[PDB]
Write a structure and sequence with these properties.
Chain lengths: 90, 90, 90, 90, 90, 90
């Protein structure tokens, strides 16, 4: 039940750049890569809280240079019930 | 035929944060997690009315900090006919 | 070939609230619950014209309190050819 | 290779009302009912040119009262090559 | 590796009218009819460059009268690598 | 683990023109052609960094003449973890 980091962008170029900067900046695993329409894509990572916080800061900053960031967030310990609604693979 | 709580967000980060805050704030079960396009996602919970009201208040407040809330509502006792149109799992 | 009532909302919370208020306010059956993108959802009911008119008035009013109503309408007797394009279940 | 009539609406309520008014106003057959996203729905009819012109005039007028009409048009004789891109059923 | 002509419209009525005017105005074959969301539809034709240029001019003009044209273009000789991303049928 | 070039357009005509100009301007392979809704399409190429940079410059310039460019970017060496979220074919 590790920390969860999320970066949502409008556009796929921003999502790919966020994903690359997140995995490169800290020891985190890509666990979600979700499209919900209206061009919105959410990149999700998991790891220890410090690594996830560093990853989301790097990802949002990198995606904002090339594209459009909608939201970014860290959940240090998602409730066990939340795992049902999280993606099962990136 | 328990109470139904709904939080609809524009963006997946807001939906995940609403879902986490709803299940953490009261004894409710996640029963819906629906995408309808235009980036709209609806998170649905069920439980006793007091727990559902507390969950929707927590979820809408949490989602509004990180994303965009479209609507939130509680139906204390959905009509039996309505169960046909509700999701069958989250 | 009974009367048809339609409530179209932008957002799922408005659609669920319309559906609940429609079935609770009159003796009508839920026959359609359709998503067409751009967050638009249409709730459809059937029954005798008086019941359908009461249902659509209740549904549009209820959905407007919690969400956004796009259109609402009653067709007292849809032409037989129209049944081809109507949903086959809610 | 009969005449083709088209009414495109933003919203399903407008599309259903166009379809009902088209089939009721003239001897035309419903041959298309297509969703392309952004809430756009196109209703298509076929028949003799006079019937199709009457149907499209009735459909666009009826849909404009309850919803939003995007476009309406009549093609008196679609080119044989065009039949490939037309729907195969309503 | 013949010339490629493209007409992209917002709305299906504009796409059908473009397709009909393109095939009627010159000796071209319909090779693509693609939906990408946000109501965008791209009609594609192939043939000799003069026929394709005449087709795209006719199609964009016809679609602009009834609907909304987003873009139109002619590629006289698409690179062999591009054939991978072109539709395999209209 | 070669360089990755991305051109995202609003509209398919811009995407096809970007893809053609990218493959024609440098020795790059088309590796992605992705639709995410809201009319957004991302064209992806791979190759040596100099070829990818030349391809993305040519593609964005060409797509901007005929359509709308949302973003363009080059990643000289995507992190190994990123390959999970990249398309598996164009």
């Amino acid at each position: 039940n590790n920390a969860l980091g999320l970066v949502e962008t409008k556009g796929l170029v921003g999502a790919i750049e966020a994903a690359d900067a997140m995995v490169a900046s800290a020891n985190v695993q890509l666990v979600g890569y979700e499209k919900i329409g209206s061009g919105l894509v959410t990149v999700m990572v998991r790891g220890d809280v410090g690594a996830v916080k560093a990853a989301v800061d790097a990802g949002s900053a990198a995606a904002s240079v090339v594209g459009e960031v909608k939201s970014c967030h860290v959940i240090p310990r998602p409730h066990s019930d939340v795992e049902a609604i999280l993606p099962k693979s990136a």
